[PDB]
Amino acid sequence: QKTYQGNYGFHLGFLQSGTAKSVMCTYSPPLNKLFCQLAKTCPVQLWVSATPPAGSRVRAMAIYKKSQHMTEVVRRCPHHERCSDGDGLAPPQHLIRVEGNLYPEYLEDRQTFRHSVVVPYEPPEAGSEYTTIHYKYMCNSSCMGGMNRRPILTIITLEDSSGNLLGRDSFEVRVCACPGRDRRTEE
Ligand SMILES: [Zn+2]
Numbered sequence: 001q002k003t004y005q006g007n008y009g010f011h012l013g014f015l016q017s018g019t020a021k022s023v024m025c026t027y028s029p030p031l032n033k034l035f036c037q038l039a040k041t042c043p044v045q046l047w048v049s050a051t052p053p054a055g056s057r058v059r060a061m062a063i064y065k066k067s068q069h070m071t072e073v074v075r076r077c078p079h080h081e082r083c084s085d086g087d088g089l090a091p092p093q094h095l096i097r098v099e100g101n102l103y104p105e106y107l108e109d110r111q112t113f114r115h116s117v118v119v120p121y122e123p124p125e126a127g128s129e130y131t132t133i134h135y136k137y138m139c140n141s142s143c144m145g146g147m148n149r150r151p152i153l154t155i156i157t158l159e160d161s162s163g164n165l166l167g168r169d170s171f172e173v174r175v176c177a178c179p180g181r182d183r184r185t186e187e
Contacts, residue, residue, distance in 0.1 A: 001063075001153060003169045009049025010158045010167025013130055019187075023180040028187055033172040034154070035179035035186075038140050039085070041099055044156065045130040046121070048167075055161035056121035059107075060096050060135055061114060065151040065172060073114050076139045077146030085138065090117070095147075096154065099134045121158060137175040147175075 005011055014027035014034070025036035036042050046058060062074040074095055075081075081092050090097045090106050094115045098104040105118040117135075124131045135154070139146045151172055158167035176182050 001155065001168075001170050004165065004167055005049075005169075006158070006165070006167035007050070008052050008158065008167055009047070010052075010169065011047050012156055012169040012171065013045030013047050014171075015043060015045075019180040019184045021178060021180050026179050026183050027171070028183050031172065031183075031186060033174065033183075033186070035174050035176060035183040036137060037177065037179060038175055039136050039138055041134045041136050043132045043134050045132050046156070046158075047130045048158075051123060052121055052158060052166055053160055056166060057118050057159050057161070057163075058121045058133060059116050059118045059155075059157045059159060060098070060133075061116035061155045061157070062095050062152045062173070063114070063155060064147075065153050069150050073112070074147065074152050075115060077143040077148075079145065080139050080143065091115075095137060095139050097136050097138060099136055101133065137173065139175060140177075141173075141175045 017026035024040045025042045027034050064070050075093050076095050086092050098117050101119045107116050141147050142149050153170045154173050155170045
């Protein structure tokens with residue numbers, strides 16, 4: 001999917017990680033793909049060249065990468081939906097959760113029924129040029145009844161207070177047992 005830096009030069013950044021066998025989450029620049037273990041926090045950096053207007057929001061939504069599956073709402077498999085691992089904020093069917101943020105909004109589009117999680121957009125801390133949001137994936141890419149080995153992307157959208165698009169970026173994601181090994185193979 002096309003990126004849209006927009007008027008605020010919005011784009012994503014990822015901490016440099018290796019491919020050690022025990023790594024828990026690692027990003028591949030050449031594949032623009034995140035490899036992470038089930039439910040493991042993934043810090044994602046939000047970079048801007050200019051400060052978005054007050055009240056802006058940041059939405060994270062998952063979609064299937066392949067054209068033939070793109071219309072299907074990405075959700076957790078029946079097993080995980082029922083495993084009772086909710087934090088009391090995220091609906092049990094949501095694949096993507098946010099952690100370390102007091103204001104997450106778990107939404108479901110009235111028309112597409114697609115799930116997404118929004119947090120307020122906040123400027124970078126003191127002595128920092130980016131803002132970090134921590135995401136976690138509650139299902140494995142291999143989950144039958146769920147993603148069922150189908151690769152997905154995590155569309156991150158900067159929107160204004162009215163929900164208008166300000167910027168957009170994305171990255172592919174693979175939730176697996178050994179991110180380090182899988183990253184190496186796919187590369
Ligand atoms: Zn699952």
